[PDB]
Design a protein around this ligand. Structure first.
Ligand SMILES: [Pb+2]
Ligand SMILES: [Pb+2]
Lengths: 123, 124
């Protein structure tokens, strides 16, 4: 059994982070003592957040993990939807890059603010 | 001269958005019971174009300060856009790596239960 400080140390995260996850309903119930189940939960959360998952996605995955008898098809759908999201964002960012490159080309090294091609194209 | 509602109509933005920009120091003082004029409209349009090019409120604040000083060199405007381009390029690299990571995750499950789920099991 561990206090929150020792749990945080073992999970390589701050006490305030553990308390954030508690306030968001991501940790099972536990002065308050914690054990191996809580540590493994924190590690699971950590790996999900490192794969860009939101708290809502993690809450859904945890609910499925807690119910081993349920079908896991929705897990595949969650990851597929995330992949689709990232692909759309990449397209948007490339278009933004090209837009900004065009903006940059509108001005040179030796001008005043009054003559600035960037400021003038934004006006 | 215009009230805020008319200014918002002309700039194609909400009154609350105008007030947000005011609270953030992005708009000059009202022309005159607050009244606005053409200068405020052109400012809102400038802000709109900047935000559509992914600029943050801090970058916009910087650009506005340089716009308000026409006698200065505009070299720092070029540097601001160059730094933004560099930022976007790094983000694109990170996102592509994330995409490839998520594709690998998805490949780990391929009519199973949660107990046997390859995705859930790889995250445990
Ligand atoms: Pb699955
Ligand atoms: Pb310039």
């Amino acid at each position: 059994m561990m206090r929150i400080g020792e749990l945080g140390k073992k999970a390589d995260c701050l006490v305030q982070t553990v308390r954030f996850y508690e306030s968001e309903g991501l940790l099972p119930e536990p002065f308050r003592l914690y054990d191996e189940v809580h540590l493994q939960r924190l590690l699971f959360i950590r790996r999900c957040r490192a794969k860009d998952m939101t708290l809502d996605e993690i809450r859904q995955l945890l609910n499925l993990r807690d119910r081993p008898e349920l079908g896991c098809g929705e897990v595949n759908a969650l990851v597929d939807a995330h992949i689709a999201q990232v692909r759309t964002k990449m397209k948007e960012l490339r278009a933004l890059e090209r837009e900004l490159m065009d903006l940059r080309r509108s001005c040179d090294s030796a001008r005043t603010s009054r003559e600035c091609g960037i400021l003038n194209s934004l006006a």
